[PDB]
Amino acid sequence: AAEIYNKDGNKVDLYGKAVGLHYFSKGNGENSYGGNGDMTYARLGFKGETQINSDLTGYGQWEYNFQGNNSEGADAQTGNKTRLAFAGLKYADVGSFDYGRNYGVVYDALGYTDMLPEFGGDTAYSDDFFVGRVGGVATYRNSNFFGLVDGLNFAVQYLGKNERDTARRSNGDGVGGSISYEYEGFGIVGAYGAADRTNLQEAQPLGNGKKAEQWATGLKYDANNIYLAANYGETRNATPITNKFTNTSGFANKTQDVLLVAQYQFDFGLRPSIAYTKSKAKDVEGIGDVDLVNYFEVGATYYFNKNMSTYVDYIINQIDSDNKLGVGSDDTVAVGIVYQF
Amino acid sequence: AEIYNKDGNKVDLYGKAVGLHYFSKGNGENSYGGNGDMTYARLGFKGETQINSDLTGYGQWEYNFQGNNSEGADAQTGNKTRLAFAGLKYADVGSFDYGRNYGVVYDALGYTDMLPEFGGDTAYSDDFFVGRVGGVATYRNSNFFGLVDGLNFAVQYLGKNERDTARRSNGDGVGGSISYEYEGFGIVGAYGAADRTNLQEAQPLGNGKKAEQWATGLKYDANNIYLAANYGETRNATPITNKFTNTSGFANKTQDVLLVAQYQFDFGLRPSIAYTKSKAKDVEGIGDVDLVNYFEVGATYYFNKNMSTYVDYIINQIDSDNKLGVGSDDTVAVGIVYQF
Amino acid sequence: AAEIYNKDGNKVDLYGKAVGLHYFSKGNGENSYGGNGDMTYARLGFKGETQINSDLTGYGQWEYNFQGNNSEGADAQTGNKTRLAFAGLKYADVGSFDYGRNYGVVYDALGYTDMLPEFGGDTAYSDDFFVGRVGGVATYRNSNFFGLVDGLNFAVQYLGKNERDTARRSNGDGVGGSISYEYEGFGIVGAYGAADRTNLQEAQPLGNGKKAEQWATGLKYDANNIYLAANYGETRNATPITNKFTNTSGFANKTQDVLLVAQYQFDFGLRPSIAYTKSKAKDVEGIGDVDLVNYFEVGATYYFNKNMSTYVDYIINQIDSDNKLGVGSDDTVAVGIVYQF
């Protein structure tokens, strides 16, 4: 958010952050929610907007993740990746259109509870149809309903097939949409998407069906120094899962997902957080029902100003030791310090 | 975008985000361009410092970040440094730079490398003098010691790069170019020759101690019209693969022709037509065979200097009985570009 | 650094360099000090600092290495890596604290002789406990002794365990510190650190012990355009080594290290250099004592201005062709041209 050019109708911001970060869990964290050890990383990105005329804007964004917890040896690149890369046009009262790597439209809903100091947002998987960042997506968005209805918003998204070398990262063609309304510091949102699955996905031992589906609804209140939000969603053939015992992977035939969060902002900078998150797989081959995620969160971010914060995030993991997929059951606490610009 | 300009130093950060999709028959396996999402971003810096009235120092770096991978194990596929060099420019005498930079024969091939998405097929990366290449020292003289506007020449020394593939390797070499541009007209010639490495000589396709590349070009660039043509030949330098025997190496000879015609409408549309043909000769076991053969029709629509969209359509004249197995199917690209 | 932002209490600089670089050694450089061939690279980084209140600033830095001597094929990313990524807080007259990937505290001493145009600094290994850049380190620093004594500094550093997939890049938990006094051209510094070795490091055939130790002292004279410095250090179980003959790796049970440098700065920009570096491993399994580094250096950098330089650096290698670890015995000369901002 450092504007490095603003002339001839063009404005570009370089942005990024350096995050010193450590995770603490029992042992070496192998059976924990979050893992153990150094988790330091940095982000870099640009975001630019050109005012083409008084009625039309063009824009672009790119965002990279650089892990800062690898050695300078052969593992140096582990977890480095492009998060976002897209370009688009915005025509006043008609809408915007962009194409590239961007957030799936179901995240329009899941974004409501994705507000924890470190963790949270567990169902917003990357490269997973409509719930997270995904490649090859064309997105149309409309604010205030062509200007006719203040606060009412909608979006329509086409997902292009990505035939990759893993089932986990692949998808077929799909289409999704979202609608929201925002009022006096409140919002309500619903979003839905459906897509073909690829042959490689259908071939996995877990999950069965030609189509993947995801939807979510969300409600939030954001004002008076208080933030409250809830999401409920369900998926079919879309949430990736691994049975740690049988070394087998694929997609959950169904999941039912709930996330709740409550936060308070003190004027002196401290922002306590609590939350609850549960994701339950159903009809899993050879298992039936089984929790994927189940925890309470207690944490806090201390904002010094717009550029600097520290935080702690504690996950009280309610997953138990006999979880049938072998999901980790131990707690994790993150401690972090962030410089951002 | 100018991010610094103080105490005689000027540095610009630049880049672009390109939303991009290719459409080809089926999975694109037998096509010119492939199929599917091809989105990417570029980031680079370019800087120049005033040392004294006669001398400026400069540096440039440019990276490609693919935007069409997942965030999993494949996340890095096709990520790479395109350019990385630093140099000194002595007024009325010339410039010297060293690093990863364009090969000098690209001084010619740049004339036709102007299509919305495709084109420039013979300017291979890491291929002696015709594209981007590492370990290259380049001397340039713009405007001929200051005496003649538009008259340029260059001499380039290529350092040996013994890499673990023949495709990406090269021995020591030397190359040069000369160009002259006057009132929208332009003519250029370029040639380079270099030793080949042991590993390159070991491949079953291609035989010779030296690689050579040369190309000439003519252009007309004015009155909103752009016309250009390149002709070139190579010896032991164009990489090829026989997909039927799974053998590879370099074409003993190629003869290459590229033509482009474009028109710029004031309202923003720039249509394009082109023709490209690269023919290999003396290929072991085969004789003559086409590597590239197509007509192009395309258009870029310029909103302004920072925003455009485009379509590029490759009408592939290659056919199904091509002796090397070159893809025969057409490809269409559609793109939207934000750049700064 | 190029200032891309300065307002509302926050200043951020983007910085970087492009380095055209070529090494010349006998043959293809396999038996040489430095190697042979193109070595061009670029650096990009950001560094930021925000004034939070009268006594407190927050800061962050990230720095990346992009190799420029690879092809655009499969080897394109070879040697790309994050060098630095950390964030911190600086409390006036009280000290600074940062966490992330940063210099080990023994480098507080080794920096004294790490001044050659291209080479030198041979004992400042990356990912090597306290002597170079390392991940997961928490560092407290105090400049000018709580504001009471100009030129008196100290630091205390905590190293978090990094259990990696190679012994070379791993470490256990550790602690070190440094102290320096720099009065009017003269400087003296001492630094020491110790840490647990991991099971994986213990399992290597070279090196035996539960703990790694490193310490070093430095003396410098930096004034009147003259730069003179000496470093002396010892290590236990901490310097990584490979026996190229037996093709086994691990750590030196002991090393004793000496680095010497002498430089002169002409006002017109030329800066000649001569140096000496010797590092000897002792009690090495199947060998006894063996030289790791042993050379004389002659070189020069020509500084055109703050943004541009060229250099030549020649390493006259004293290592013997019958070195028992197989250390390369051939000389290397580097020639570089650097644009930086």
Ligand SMILES: CCCCCCCCOCCOCCOCCO
């Ligand atoms: C500037 C243009 C950028 C190129 C856009 C590429 C669009 C590909 O994504 C769309 C895929 O199909 C959507 C599915 O709908 C049918 C469902 O049976």
Ligand SMILES: CCCCCCCCOCCOCCOCCO
């Ligand atoms: C005005 C020119 C002054 C030239 C002085 C001599 C320097 C040689 O370097 C230029 C070599 O260019 C080779 C051209 O290839 C043409 C293709 O056949």
Ligand SMILES: CCCCCCCCOCCOCCOCCO
């Ligand atoms: C005519 C001006 C001087 C040369 C200008 C550059 C053109 C180079 O083509 C001629 C070959 O160069 C020397 C030998 O190369 C063999 C490969 O190692």
Ligand SMILES: CCCCCCCCOCCOCCOCCO
């Ligand atoms: C001094 C002599 C005058 C030379 C004038 C410049 C000639 C440029 O040639 C460009 C011809 O391009 C045709 C492209 O067709 C593409 C459709 O298949």
Ligand SMILES: CCCCCCCCOCCOCCOCCO
């Ligand atoms: C509101 C929260 C305030 C928390 C600030 C957190 C800074 C992150 O520091 C991470 C600690 O790393 C420990 C490494 O040392 C291990 C030594 O054996």
Ligand SMILES: CCCCCCCCOCCOCCOCCO
């Ligand atoms: C404050 C104490 C600083 C002591 C600094 C001593 C500088 C040593 O310089 C290197 C020795 O060279 C010995 C022969 O030189 C020929 C090399 O080619």
Ligand SMILES: CCCCCCCCOCCOCCOCCO
């Ligand atoms: C007064 C001492 C200064 C030392 C300057 C040495 C520069 C001479 O070399 C050529 C110029 O550019 C350097 C890059 O070289 C790469 C060539 O492969």
Ligand SMILES: [Mg+2]
């Ligand atoms: Mg099902």
Ligand SMILES: [Mg+2]
């Ligand atoms: Mg031949």
Ligand SMILES: [Mg+2]
């Ligand atoms: Mg020992």
Ligand code: NA
């Ligand atoms: Na990278």
Ligand code: NA
């Ligand atoms: Na299945």
Ligand code: NA
């Ligand atoms: Na499945």
Ligand code: NA
């Ligand atoms: Na538990």
Ligand code: NA
């Ligand atoms: Na591309």
Ligand code: NA
């Ligand atoms: Na060959």
